[PDB]
Design a protein around this motif. Sequence first.
Motif, PDB file in Angstrom:
ATOM      1  N   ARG A 152       0.824  -1.201   0.000  1.00  0.00           N
ATOM      2  CA  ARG A 152       0.000   0.000   0.000  1.00  0.00           C
ATOM      3  C   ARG A 152       0.862   1.257   0.000  1.00  0.00           C
ATOM      4  O   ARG A 152       0.601   2.186   0.770  1.00  0.00           O
ATOM      5  CB  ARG A 152      -0.967  -0.007   1.188  1.00  0.00           C
ATOM      6  N   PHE A 172      -3.484   8.555  -1.933  1.00  0.00           N
ATOM      7  CA  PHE A 172      -4.909   8.359  -1.728  1.00  0.00           C
ATOM      8  C   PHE A 172      -5.707   9.644  -1.884  1.00  0.00           C
ATOM      9  O   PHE A 172      -6.926   9.622  -1.683  1.00  0.00           O
ATOM     10  CB  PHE A 172      -5.161   7.748  -0.347  1.00  0.00           C
ATOM     11  N   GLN A 201      -8.875  13.416   4.022  1.00  0.00           N
ATOM     12  CA  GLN A 201      -9.351  12.670   5.177  1.00  0.00           C
ATOM     13  C   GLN A 201      -9.880  13.583   6.269  1.00  0.00           C
ATOM     14  O   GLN A 201     -10.635  13.125   7.133  1.00  0.00           O
ATOM     15  CB  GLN A 201      -8.223  11.803   5.734  1.00  0.00           C
ATOM     16  N   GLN A 205      -6.318  -2.390  -0.835  1.00  0.00           N
ATOM     17  CA  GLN A 205      -5.565  -1.225  -1.264  1.00  0.00           C
ATOM     18  C   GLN A 205      -6.454  -0.142  -1.855  1.00  0.00           C
ATOM     19  O   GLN A 205      -5.950   0.918  -2.230  1.00  0.00           O
ATOM     20  CB  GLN A 205      -4.518  -1.641  -2.295  1.00  0.00           C
ATOM     21  N   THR A 239      -9.418   1.638  -0.513  1.00  0.00           N
ATOM     22  CA  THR A 239      -9.698   2.745   0.384  1.00  0.00           C
ATOM     23  C   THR A 239      -8.481   2.993   1.271  1.00  0.00           C
ATOM     24  O   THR A 239      -7.743   2.066   1.608  1.00  0.00           O
ATOM     25  CB  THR A 239     -10.957   2.431   1.206  1.00  0.00           C
ATOM     26  N   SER A 240      -8.250   4.271   1.599  1.00  0.00           N
ATOM     27  CA  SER A 240      -7.107   4.666   2.418  1.00  0.00           C
ATOM     28  C   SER A 240      -7.170   4.085   3.826  1.00  0.00           C
ATOM     29  O   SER A 240      -6.127   3.821   4.429  1.00  0.00           O
ATOM     30  CB  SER A 240      -7.033   6.188   2.487  1.00  0.00           C
ATOM     31  N   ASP A 241      -8.377   3.887   4.365  1.00  0.00           N
ATOM     32  CA  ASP A 241      -8.513   3.264   5.679  1.00  0.00           C
ATOM     33  C   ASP A 241      -8.138   1.787   5.630  1.00  0.00           C
ATOM     34  O   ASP A 241      -7.707   1.226   6.643  1.00  0.00           O
ATOM     35  CB  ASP A 241      -9.947   3.436   6.189  1.00  0.00           C
ATOM     36  N   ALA A 242      -8.333   1.145   4.470  1.00  0.00           N
ATOM     37  CA  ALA A 242      -8.093  -0.268   4.171  1.00  0.00           C
ATOM     38  C   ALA A 242      -8.957  -1.214   4.992  1.00  0.00           C
ATOM     39  O   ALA A 242      -8.765  -2.429   4.927  1.00  0.00           O
ATOM     40  CB  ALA A 242      -6.614  -0.658   4.324  1.00  0.00           C
TER      41      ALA A 242
END
Lengths: 305, 831, 830
Positions: free
Chosen positions: B138, B149, B245, C264, C266-269
Amino acid sequence: NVSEYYSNPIIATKLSEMISDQVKNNQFSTWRRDNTSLQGFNAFDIATINTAILPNGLSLESMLLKLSLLHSIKAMNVDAASINRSQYQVIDHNTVPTIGAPAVVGVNNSPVFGEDCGGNNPVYPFGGGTGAIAFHVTLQTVPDERKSYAIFVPPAILQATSDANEALALFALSMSEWPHALYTVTKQTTDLAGANAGQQVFIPTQSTIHIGGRRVLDLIIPRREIAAMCMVRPQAGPDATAGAIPLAAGQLFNMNFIGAPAFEEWPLTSYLYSWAGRFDITTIRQYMGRLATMVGVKDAYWAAH
Amino acid sequence: PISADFSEVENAPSFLSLAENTDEVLKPYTGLEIQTIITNIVGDANPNQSRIFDQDRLRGNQYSAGGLVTQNAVSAIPFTNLIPRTIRVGNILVNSANRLQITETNVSEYYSNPIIATKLSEMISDQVKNNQFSTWRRDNTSLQGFNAFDIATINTAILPNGLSLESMLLKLSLLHSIKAMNVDAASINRSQYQVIDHNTVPTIGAPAVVGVNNSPVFGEDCGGNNPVYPFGGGTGAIAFHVTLQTVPDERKSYAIFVPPAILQATSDANEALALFALSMSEWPHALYTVTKQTTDLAGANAGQQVFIPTQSTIHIGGRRVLDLIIPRREIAPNPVRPQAGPDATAGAIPLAAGQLFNMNFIGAPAFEEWPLTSYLYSWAGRFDITTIRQYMGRLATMVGVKDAYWAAHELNVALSQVAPKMTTAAGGWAAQAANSAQQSDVCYSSLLTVTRSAANFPLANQPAADMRVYDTDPATWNKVALGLATAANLVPEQSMDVPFVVGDARTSFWERLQAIPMCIAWTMYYHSRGITTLAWDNAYTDNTNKWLQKMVRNTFSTTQSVGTIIPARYGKIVCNLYKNMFHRAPAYVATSVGGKELHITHFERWLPGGTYANVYSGAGAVVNCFSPVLIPDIWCQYFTAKLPLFAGAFPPAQGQNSTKGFNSKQGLMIHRNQNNNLVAPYLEKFADNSSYFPVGQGPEINDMATWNGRLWMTTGNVQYLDYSGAAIVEAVPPAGELPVGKQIPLLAGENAPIELTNAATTCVPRYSNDGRRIFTYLTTAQSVIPVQACNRAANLARSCWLLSNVYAEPALQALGDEVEDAFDTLTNSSF
Amino acid sequence: PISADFSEVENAPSFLSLAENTDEVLKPYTGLEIQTIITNIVGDANPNQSRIFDQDRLRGNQYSAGGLVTQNAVSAIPFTNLIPRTIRVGNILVNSANRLQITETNVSEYYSNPIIATKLSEMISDQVKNNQFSTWRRDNTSLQGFNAFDIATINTAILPNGLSLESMLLKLSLLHSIKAMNVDAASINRSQYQVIDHNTVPTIGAPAVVGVNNSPVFGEDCGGNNPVYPFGGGTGAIAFHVTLQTVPDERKSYAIFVPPAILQATSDANEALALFALSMSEWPHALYTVTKQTTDLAGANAGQQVFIPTQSTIHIGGRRVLDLIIPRREIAAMCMVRPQAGPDATAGAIPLAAGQLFNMNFIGAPAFEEWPLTSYLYSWAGRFDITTIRQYMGRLATMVGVKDAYWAAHELNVALSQVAPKMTTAAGGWAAQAANSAQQSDVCYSSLLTVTRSAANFPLANQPAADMRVYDTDPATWNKVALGLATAANLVPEQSMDVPFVVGDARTSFWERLQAIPMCIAWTMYYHSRGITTLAWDNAYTDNTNKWLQKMVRNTFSTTQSVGTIIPARYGKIVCNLYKNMFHRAPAYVATSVGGKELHITHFERWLPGGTYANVYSGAGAVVNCFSPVLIPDIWCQYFTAKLPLFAGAFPPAQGQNSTKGFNSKQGLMIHRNQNNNLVAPYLEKFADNSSYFPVGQGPEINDMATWNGRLWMTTGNVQYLDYSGAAIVEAVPPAGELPVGKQIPLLAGENAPIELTNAATTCVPRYSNDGRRIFTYLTTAQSVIPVQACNRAANLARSCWLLSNVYAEPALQALGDEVEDAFDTLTNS
């Protein structure tokens, strides 16, 4: 003002194209404990680092600039007869310096307007901060949120300097942030006829240049053999020593001369405050000798110098 | 052109040949064409030598009907973007007893020039991302200042419009035109402080003071230091985030990327966040004023009038809550500069408000919203036009801002230069009185009355829209300001390719001259068919005469094809009456139906709703007749390459022959009704066979006969009656009086216009409200010399200007590409 | 098109010529280009607001039958996705005394684009058949981390069961349109909160709040703090297992591999496991609400109404047992070594709110334990932002092909989530029902087909009949696709910039509201061509003796099945051709193989037989099921259409030459004239044994001359629907000349109501009774002399019209002149 390079992009070598078919064709004839050829990271770094696609091929322009700024700071500590006396007289013209004892390159010793940026609890001069270093052998040991910013320390850097641990500190200083601390140059001077012998404190101009933008270092060390677990402490480590004697720390006191667990964070400034009387220009000279043997440092330094 | 003799009145082009389509590519109208006639500057640029303060009007000799020559008689430039909220009544300053004139746009997103993902966007998808699908990794492929992201949620589904940098670039094109009043005193005219308040003399010396929220009447200090929006009481909210975010869970799609190219180490670098947050949000955030030291006519009572410019009364935006994502240096993981934000300071104004700013808050923490009317009030004395120019040059390096700023700039000129209506008088130079609706009643260049406000400020009523303009969406801006998409109107440029108007002191002078050919083109549109002013006002839904509903229906922009604007029919008639009449094309934007790409000018994006260019009498009474006449004629004649035949200068008396007419050899006839006393001119052959128009017929465009009708109402005693000599519903001027231009204060050795010289004679009424034909009549005794002048057996003594026709070719340097400077003839191979 | 004169009515295509098969390209008809037909509109009293909150209605001038112009008169936009659970009754909020409308789909296998074994599956195909076991215990796959033992379990499978992403990406698009009300108050219409609850204005300012299990009455707090499924007593089970050798040894055949690309996305995962548990299992997991601050008609009683979206009452899924398998970080019941195969498994943010087996352990992931599934989706129920769904769709597009598979799935929620109240019989314009009534919230699809209202209490005991056929997503093909063992023809990966632009936008709820209108025009022209009066449609399965009326319902709806494949309906391709030949836009489809032949299917072709259709209520609330099914008024059919048929044409203006006439025996028609009972009928078609009773197996002929002529007499004002002989029919007749008229929403400043048959639905001419009997439209002999002379082209008629874009107000004294009359028209392109 730092910016990306994008100019001479990365060409994938014979090795990356070799284990490119060991992932796409799913040839997993691999194991848990197998390192690379004689350098010692892991064989699992293909599924993490050879996977990357980036056209982001960079140059050694900023690490070798701030590696040349350190050089010109600690080049006042050579001899009194190898530096001009006009250099100590350009701004303070009511002064003559003295041949004899040389200049003393100190760190965080400036008396006024702050400038003891953590005189015994070191912080960055260009912002309230201290940074973080964690010496991890692998990517599967990090704070699981900065894997994309982990720096492999190849063994050639650990073979550059004879101490082999002044060369992590020259690699933590060159990759992270300039300045880590506010260097001074103290020299015994006298007045115009010679009556009042004293020692002026100077600060070099190259210790007030904000270059870097990275405070989170997560350096990864090779393994000695093919084989939180601090009993097996050389799992991926020769050593990690915090400086010689210059301890002088505050919050999270830093004078453990050996400490290298699996993953713990240190104050970065303190680790560079501790290796701050040890960066002799002959040590930088042999550190540049092994840099030239693995990457091209000839034209990249005359531009940075 | 003005006429030397009658043989070039007669051999003048028609209306139908001059409204035809043109295939030439023409240069833009720079405003220098009127300039190189009415001023001492003909050649080139002049910093402060050229006193533009005194060079503000048409000057020339005149020739009366009685054979006398008037030496220095002046006509005012009739356009200004300044409404005097302090009026000098009785040589002393008092507050205005009049509401503020407000406009409102119709911001909506349309199908602009199509957009396509670049090689960087196909590089992020193909590589990196797609390759994280096998490696269990990631990692962050961060582009320049944002997370991977953050780019990954924007390199996504793209809208099939393409963006138009029009609303933000009209706000930039608009605050520029406000903040260019404080440049000097000898760079801004004194006539444009005198267009509405004509009992006023501004001074060389102290410049204008461009203030904010300090107007003394009818509210209008919309929170003098507790600022709200002028249109809708509210303060907005701005937040400076470093990630998507942090944008809470609600908005997150409205979030605007601030690109790192507009903020570099080249300027203050934190004012550019306020120009970005001012371009992207809402206009107006505050009600700007222009306060200048003025004096009365003789010069005793030196005070300071408060003005409000017209472009601080234009309601554009609809974005009141901004969430701006800021570039985070090079590359860093997610976290008072938490994640390496370069900056977010409040301003320079102390601003005791509801959140209580102290003097200048430096703050970029995670969410921590400010107000937006407060954040823009602090950056309201700092937006000088040089900073706006270099901000435009930093925009132009990443997107194509050359043609879009010029379209947005003559959109600014189209809806900001605003002119008072008329006053009917016999001779020359009538104006209105002080503290009255009639002095402040005012019109566009499109002969269309500007709406003033109904109640006190900040407004809850939200009046009807006046013009359809486009807008930048945030979601496509977030990917075209980041290398992820591109179009043909968005190809980047250099700061040399920024237009010449930007950052120059001479904008308040040039923009009022660019608006004159707009009103010449609309003036010739509304005068070819004379439908007075009543059959324009209540004409949209009249069940009589289906022709008239088709006229007013088509003139405005009320059609669509696919999700985009179809521009107006009959506004291309005005555009072709601009390109043919001036040999210079007005700036279009692109709209695409699908595949086919077509062009819409401010000539084709107006909206219905609103009255037209009324005329007042000497006592202030309404004279809704004639035709929507605004500026006086000589503007609609002299500054013109090819003026159609019905509008023409009455030629000077040279020998025995001065002014003649058009008779039955050109296919015309005399009306000659029931009674023997009053007779009409040589009208068409259809005029005696109508008496009332059929329900699909209107006034036929005849310029032999429209000339011949203004040739009779110049006589000075006419009545506008009927087929049979009966009265009409429309309000008639009290005598043989015509609409005449606004009177400004004179100077030494400088005269007033004499007799029908600063007038508008072209507005011949031909179509009443009832659908009946209007005839201009004379007594049988007083029509013998006009009838025999039509028969070329006599002459009519008419007054004229003693000017000559030049009309030079375009320059195309305009003080905006002085690349001759010696340090780039040698850096020239490297461009 | 709107008719400016009668020469545009005569020059209109027929129904047969507008329903042939066409073979053009025909781009899809997005609501991004339907927003401009309702915004850029002709009118001078129109204030032209720029925000979506005010650009909802159809505003325009109207010209009456007597020659009077009404300035700014509005027609309601009649399609919402919001059931009001709290009605403004008696100027204050009471909760609703009405049940909730439920839908249900019918899942089926795909079998159409079967799996082709890739280079990898054929690579380790010889490592099993030739018994090349050079493998070990701990070896994972290449960089993704499941196990190498998955070849002996999953590559072993042989299945021709290659599926599509049709049902996971439908219920992933239903979640999108729920949480697209939480964007801004100025990006959703106020008419959408006023379609069913018309005694209400909502408030700009604070947006709507998307809650979950908050509905006050009729149950609907389906486990308000102990969550259960709404469509059955259940809770489900999730167990996050790294391998197949860890499961409850009885559901190995149904285990779902979660590939690392989803982890991979979503950023939160870990919001991306919950978007993958929500998309693979079951819809709905809970009963979503949308609470918004509203006020009454003048503004006195500020409150907050609770709505439930229509897309949170669709039963799609049929899987409650989830056993998800997570990749390993490294090559290497044992909860000490907890990342043996797990990054993490977190149960929601804060929303805990649990009962039996309390669920607020934010980390818990052992080797194999079961959780309440609903609770795990109740905990991730305030976190599914449309920008999170936008980037979740970005990585889906990079591994499978999601472009065409989403526009099909986005178009068949608009087909069954944009739901509209039926009608109300009235004389003039703008009627509505009541404050609390079962007939106000009575509500219909865009398919002219009444939504099933729940009879029981939530959680529902008896589950009703299904409405539309959909496909499914199984684990058995998803596991081979996620691992490179399987590539199909409809699964070629693409880029993130090729995701449908609806995904993640604030304007979806306004666009989906507009995409439903050209569906209901196609169904409206389908049900009005033959006038098969709503009891004949309703009772075509209840009691029928006619071989024709049972044939009409059997064909129109997708009844046939061969083996595991949605067979497209006959006569729903007629509806699909009334969308292509009529809007010049084709609707989105999927590929489907029936007998080895490749054919395409649309949501027009996927409906199921049964159900009440769209009838009309009276002013007092009685059922008026004597028309054809109507759901939307005339102007929405006529203003939005490129090429419209003859029988449904706009009435041209009143006081003009060539105004409003009919079609007589010169066009082949015949008049009926039962003048003994002072009762005559139009010029209708010739009978041919259709005079009183239709033949057994035949129904009404498609005639547009006579259906135009029949609605030309329904608009007169005292209309009788009797018989060949003039006797009453079994069906419920409206009280007068009282055509069904549109729903009335509250007015704004400077803005009028419709005047007279301008917001009406005229086209629904009854022609076929329930008895198999012909229905005649009658006027009295005295009051039909003027329509008969209008049919004989010896008079004009005076009907009200919308003055829109070519339609001008006609003067009373037509004092015409010459011809030509081109003033500025030849100067333009004419």
